[PDB]
Every structure is written in structure tokens, then in C-alpha cells.
């Protein structure tokens, strides 16, 4: 009676607090259908009743349940539960629920008709006596406990059964936690980073006795870094609450705001107190305020505080039940005596979320906001490039405050204060988000972005041999390195795209980074010129370090000849080969870990002026010439660029291809965009004509770009590439294996 | 009896301390003409009598009144008032006004003939007992309270009615503020910046209980910057006085 009823809890994908999700093999093995009331027994003689639905991404021992039912059963994620199917009641008699005093503060009116009324409508959910569930609305989350269940111990929703529940807030029992706290569900983005932290602190915190039966040292120094406002303390609170370990919080300014001896005593007291209540986590945030760089300690008491922290961190190699996590802003901003083995040896980079992550955070913060239907969070998530989690929290709060300041406060004239049901009847518009996102939110980001890009192979037009070459060079090795070992060949860790300007080098590299499903760190030309002009070429190493903190990557050193082309080009400053930044790139590339899947890709428009020491073997050496596109590729270029715009049937892409030769793809995209510009101008003239009606439903502005626009904007087509350009490119080609 | 008589106070464009400005749709709806003595009831059982004129840049719930009458009615900007038309007296009998000790310091001579003399000339203004108004001149601003109103409780200017008011400075009641202090009218320029600060601190400071019924974090750190001598502390004093919140200065 052990085999079919043991599974392990994990995270959820669904949002309903009553659904539990199991994989298909187990549900056909368990003989279970959809909708069936099932019962879960967990730790401490606790129960949970649940409706079951089917999902895909699980194994045969994983159960996905939301945080509410997980806390209802008195178990935590990664533990085991016992699951038995029961028979159904399919009615109710008279249920009774009470609110909680800890969640209800300053709520006026009655909670019943506004919350519990719309909740149990057409969604058959089972409930048990003595549980805790949560309802969202009116920019709050309210807890309700079921006290009395008349017909069975467990009873499904059944609209004949009205709720009589007009009672006072009942005192929350002191052993159990609220569900408005933080957990793994309340962190948007950071899937990889939560994966690393969850696998790092699973064993020492969940299973403490295991580390008394082996001599193995688990990692005890974790350092979280990332831009400010990215919610690093939130991750620690979450991990603390989800493992159930004691959480102590030290902070930088509070330690530096006390007297000397008293700051020493608090730093000692924190460590000894947290060691008393093992297993624990000690979280020191704003580490760079309490322990900066050596030369940046102008005082004496600062060095005593740093040394006190050092000797306490070295007095922890005896204990295995304490983990210390700290938070900083950048790794080279704290004392290097801390970032050593035994003190702070694991480093985790939180970093900036992306479009999916920004969508995740916006769904977290508007979870109980009662948005309208027209608001499209995808638009916002695409239009918030450069915002971190705190800015999106400020965005949602500011949008709500805009949606409460322009109306329904100055309509509260006959009324004096806010009504509950009035507050619930607060929808937000897309224009409200356009207002909040347009002005008053300065994005706090000037940082390099590292993410998986979004252009794919269907976008670049043509160059299919280059596709089957890049796929080889990037994917072939990392997929299955056994063949390379049998034949003893080192992988190539570089390509050099050379060709005319604007034929799709960046597009190609972003596409090969997309298909490989790896990060993409782009280093522009202006950045290299900045590092040459300011003469601080040291921080180039930082970039590579960043690459190894986000592995796998595709470093893309665009405009690699810009330094040479700014230094007089062919003649100027004596006329040597190498420069500062390119030397530093060589020194950092040669001395890097020979297998990390970090793939360096160059780019250049003038392949001869680059210094010859870069294409020696062991560096980026597999030169690829990006050719000027031809007819069969020009048609693909043109249709791929037009694929986001309306186009009619009379557009002769064949004649367009045949007509335009020696034009780079950039110029064809200029032709397309300028044709769309003329189309836009024509439409605004049509809008002014039909706006200036005779008295002042024939609304259609003809949203179809006719042939006239293309055949007129084609007069503004300019050849950006001469003939001698192609000729010196062929002259560089003959200096390769083609004709030499 | 709720619908026609509820509007919200806002800033003024006119400088006379007796004119109140309403938009054209409301005044044709309310059946009101120019010049009519009207009465305003506000918070704490307080009253205000006012001549009305027409303006353009308002909505149908906005009333523009100067700071003097706004402080006379014991209300602040952004709150609601009740507005009823009354009938006119069109004379006076013997009014009596007194000066305030807090405004009058080191003034020598008599305040009567120099100030109250040119003030009530050819400008028919209604007054009520127990109000506070302000007169400007001689590089000062002097406060005057009306104590006794013989024919009606409210009486319009009427030059046959001379003022007998030769009295000592009367002690300013300690719950009400002077009108030589700072407010939104006493800041020149900065329309956009006052717009941002007024929309930022309207809800947390005027309506405190609202932020106990929702989990929403209002902004709490505001940083004002600009060249020195641009009056940044003045803006804070102003916003403090206009919302009625406690103001601490470090
Ligand atoms: N990934 C995320 N998921 C949810 N909330 C986030 C995320 N990133 C940032 N936030 C929000 O941004 C803020 C981060 O600021 P921080 O100083 O780390 O918080 P704290 O007040 O706990 O110190 C928090 O209010 C948090 O709600
Ligand atoms: N094969 C192609 N398919 C689709 N778009 C292309 C192609 N070639 C060029 N483009 C256009 O050219 C631009 C990219 O130019 P790029 O090659 O990055 O310039 P550079 O060579 O100076 O780095 C994009 O805006 C894109 O629209
Ligand atoms: N926009 C303005 N409106 C009215 N007065 C101003 C304005 N800007 C500056 N001033 C004047 O300039 C001075 C600003 O100096 P400041 O140091 O800010 O004043 P305070 O003495 O209150 O600290 C004040 O006397 C103020 O009267």
C-alpha cells in the first residue's frame, strides 16, 4: 500500500489553489480521471482535499500543487506525501467560513458579498474543515478558514448551498504562517538562478542529519550580485520560508550606524544566535557598505569590522548547519580577502530579467488588481526594455494610483470614504499603462544585456550554406564531443565574419545564438572606442568574466576594426598593427578555459586592416565571407522584412529582385520602411480629409500598402556599395585558399 | 438637494479676495447671474459669503476661490463645499472691523484712513461677521476681522455706510492661521513641478485611511533639486500648509 501513493512535491504552473497536476503514466497507473475528489495525508496528521487535472512536464514521482494547498497539508516542497482517491458527495448543506484578523485590517463593509460571492461560481472545488484558503481582489488577498462542514467532512462547490458566515475575524493559530508571505511562486523571472540556489541548499537545509554521517563539506559561502532593486533579499526570504530554516537578517548601514564596540557585539551576537538555532541562514545585505575595498577604508574602525567579519567567517568551517548568503552590487566592489575558498566561494549573478521574465513580474504584481480585458501585458513587457523588478513594482503601483486619482475619488462627493465594492469596481486601461510607462518612470539601466535573442533562421533571407556551417561550428562539438575525442581534434572557438556593411552579420550571429539556446553578450564598436579613448582597457577582462558567469554565451565583438579605422586607418601613429584593446582581447582569449562553451564571434567591414595576430590558430581563425545577396535570397530578404506589414498581391517581388542589384539588405529594409513611411503619410492625409467632414462606416483608411508606394520610394534607392568594394573583397578572397 | 450644490475647490487665476469663479454650464444649470451674493457652507459649521463672476478654464465640479475666502470657510483645496444662492441686502448700517496683533507690529499712526478708506470704493463686496480679510499696501499686508454687522448677517459694500472701527488690535484666535504665510498662490513659476508634487502627495496626505484598505505602496522618497536660491524649502512649506500635514524641518 506503499507503491502507488508516494510522490514528491514541486513547483506549479497553474494558478488555481485547488488543482493538483500529475503526469499521464501515473494517472493511468493510479486509475484516475479528471475532476475526482482525492485526499492527501502529510506530516503531523494533516489532510488536504483536492480536485485533480492532467499536465505534461512531470515525472512519475512529482506532484504539482499551489502554495495554498501545500501549506494546508503541513508539508514543504521536496518532501513526500500519501495520495488516496475518495468518493464524491456532489452537494453541500450549510458551510461556514471565517476571516483572519492578520489579513483583515482597515477593510470596511462586509467581506461576504464582494469576495465569497463571485468565488464559488461554476468552479466545483472541494473543501475540508479547518483548512486555510485565499481569495484575491480589491488590491488585497484575504484568508478564509472553514470551520463547519455539515453533510460530509469534505464538500464540493454546489450553488444551492449559500454561505452563512457573518462572523468576527478569528485569531490566526500561532504555529502556522500566512500565505501573503514570500515563496518560490512570488518571484518572477530567475529560473536558472533559483535552480542553482535550490540545488545548492537542498541537502544542508532540508536533511541536516545526512551531513553527520559523511565527511563532505557543503558550500557555505554564497554571494548574490546584480543591479540594485533586483530583489536579492526577496530570494533569501523565499528560500528561508520554503526550506523552513531560521532566517537572520544583518544589514550594512545598521551595523555602521552604531558605536564601535556595539557594532562588534551585534556582529558577534548575530552569528552565535543563528548558530544556536541550526539549521539557519545568515543574510548580510549591502555587503559592499560593511566591507569595501582595502584602500577605500580611510578609517581604522572599518578595518576592525572587516577583520571581525573575516574571523567569524573562518570560525564556521567547523559547523555544517549554517549557510551565509550576502548581497552586493558587483563582484569587484568588495574586499578581495572575502572572495576566497572557505569564505565566499560560490557566486551567483541574478541579473536583469527579459521579456518572459518581465511578463512574469507584471503577472506577479497585478495578481489581484482586476485588470480590464483590453490591457495587453505583452505590449508592456516589450515596451519596458531596461526595467528591473523594483521599477515594474513602481509601474504597477503608479498605474493603480493613476487609476484611483483621476476618477472615483472626486466621484466620492456624496460619499465620504472609499467603499469596498466601489474599490473592487476599479479596472485599468491600456492608455493608463501607456501614461505610467510613457512618463515619470526613468529606467535604471545602462548595463549590457545578456539573454537569449528572438530573431530566428526564418528571418535572415538566404545564406543556407552559412547556416549549415555555423550549425556545425557552434552546435556540432557541444552536442556530442565523443567523435572529437576519438579523432583528437580541438574545437574551433572562433569565427570572423568579413564582408560588406549591412548584409546581416549581427542577424546571423543572433540567429545561431537563438537555435543553440544560449545567451548572447553583444559588444558594440562604440564600446571598444570608449575603452580605447578613456585608456582603461583593463575592464575588458570583466566582460570575459561576465561571459563565464553566464555560460554558454556567444560573445559578439562587432566592428572589430573600428579602433584601427579611428587610428588613421591605413596610415597614422607610426603605422603598426596592434593597439591597446585588441592586445587585451588576445590576452584574455588565449588564457581562458579551453572548454566552457564560450564562443567568440568577430565581425568587420574591412578585413585587411585588422592586425594579423588575431587569426593565428588557437584564436578566432575560421574566416567566413558574407556575400552580397542575390535574387533567390533577395526575394527571401524582402518577404521576411515585409512579413510584419500588410502587402497586396500586385507586388512583384520577382521584378523587385531583378531590378535591384548590388544593394545590401540594409538598403532594401530602408526601401521597405520608407515605402511604409509614405503609406503612413497617405493614411494621415486620408484621416484629415475624412476628419474634415461636411458637417464638421467609411472609416477604413485602406490599411494595405499598394504598389504605388514601393514604385515611388524605389526612386530613392541608393547603392551604398561601389564596385571596387566587391573587388577588394575578392582581392582578400584570393589571399585565402580559393586561388592562392 | 445634493446634486446642484457640490463642487471641489482648486487654484485661482483672479486676485480679488471676494470673487469666486465657476464654469459656464454650471452657472446656467444653477440659474445664477453675475454679482449675486451666494453662501458657502464648509467643514466645522463655517460660512462664507461671496460675489460670483464667470470664467472659462473649469469643469462642472471645480470652484476657483482665492486663499483668503478659502481659509475663511475652514476648508482646503481639493475638498468639497456646499453652495446656495441667497437674496441681497443692497445696503449697510454700521459695520465694525478690528485689526490683528499678529500682523500689526511697528505700524504708527491710524490704520483706518490709509487702508480701509480706498479699499471699499466702488467695488461692491459682501462681508459676514467673524470673517478674516486682508488688505495690501505700504509694503505690508494687514488683516481685519469683522465683529458686528448691524442690518443683516451679510452686507455688501454701500458707501453711505462709513466705518466706525477705532479699536485696539484683537488677539488672533489660536486655532486658525495667518494669511501672510505661504501657499500655492505664493510661488511664482513652476506649474509643471507643482503639478507633479500635488498629484504625488494628494492621496497619502489628504486621505490617510484609504491606504489602510489596500496593499499599495505610495512613493515616500522625493528629491528636489535645482540651483541654489530657487526656493525649494518654500515649496515644501507650501505643500505642508495646503494639505494641513505636520511639517518638520531638519
Ligand atoms: N523577480 C521578482 N519577483 C517579484 N518581485 C520582485 C522581483 N524583483 C524585484 N521585485 C520587487 O522589487 C523590490 C526589490 O527591492 P529590495 O530592496 O530587494 O526589497 P526589500 O524591501 O525586501 O529589501 C521588492 O519590493 C520586490 O517586490
Ligand atoms: N539577410 C537578411 N535578412 C534580413 N534582414 C537583413 C538581411 N541582411 C540585412 N538585413 C537588414 O540589415 C540590418 C542589419 O545590418 P548589419 O548587417 O547588422 O550591419 P553591419 O554589417 O554594419 O553590422 C537589419 O536592420 C536588417 O533589417
Ligand atoms: N517661485 C518663487 N516664488 C516666490 N518666491 C520665491 C520663488 N523662488 C524663490 N523665491 C524666494 O527666494 C528665496 C529662496 O531662498 P530659500 O533659501 O529657498 O528660502 P528659505 O529662506 O525659506 O530657506 C525665498 O525668500 C523666496 O521668497
UniProtKB/Swiss-Prot annotation, chain A:
Changing residue 286 to Q: Defect in ubiquitin-dependent protein degradation by the proteasome. ATP 1 binds at residues 228-234, 329, 365. It comes from the Eukaryota. Changing residue 166 to K: In CMT2Y; normal ATPase activity; impaired autophagic function. Residues 689-701 are annotated as: Disordered. The modification N6-acetyllysine is found at residues 483, 486, 649, 728. Changing residue 107 to F: In IBMPFD1; uncertain significance. Necessary for the fragmentation of Golgi stacks during mitosis and for their reassembly after mitosis. Involved in the formation of the transitional endoplasmic reticulum (tER). The transfer of membranes from the endoplasmic reticulum to the Golgi apparatus occurs via 50-70 nm transition vesicles which derive from part-rough, part-smooth transitional elements of the endoplasmic reticulum (tER). Vesicle budding from the tER is an ATP-dependent process. This is Transitional endoplasmic reticulum ATPase.
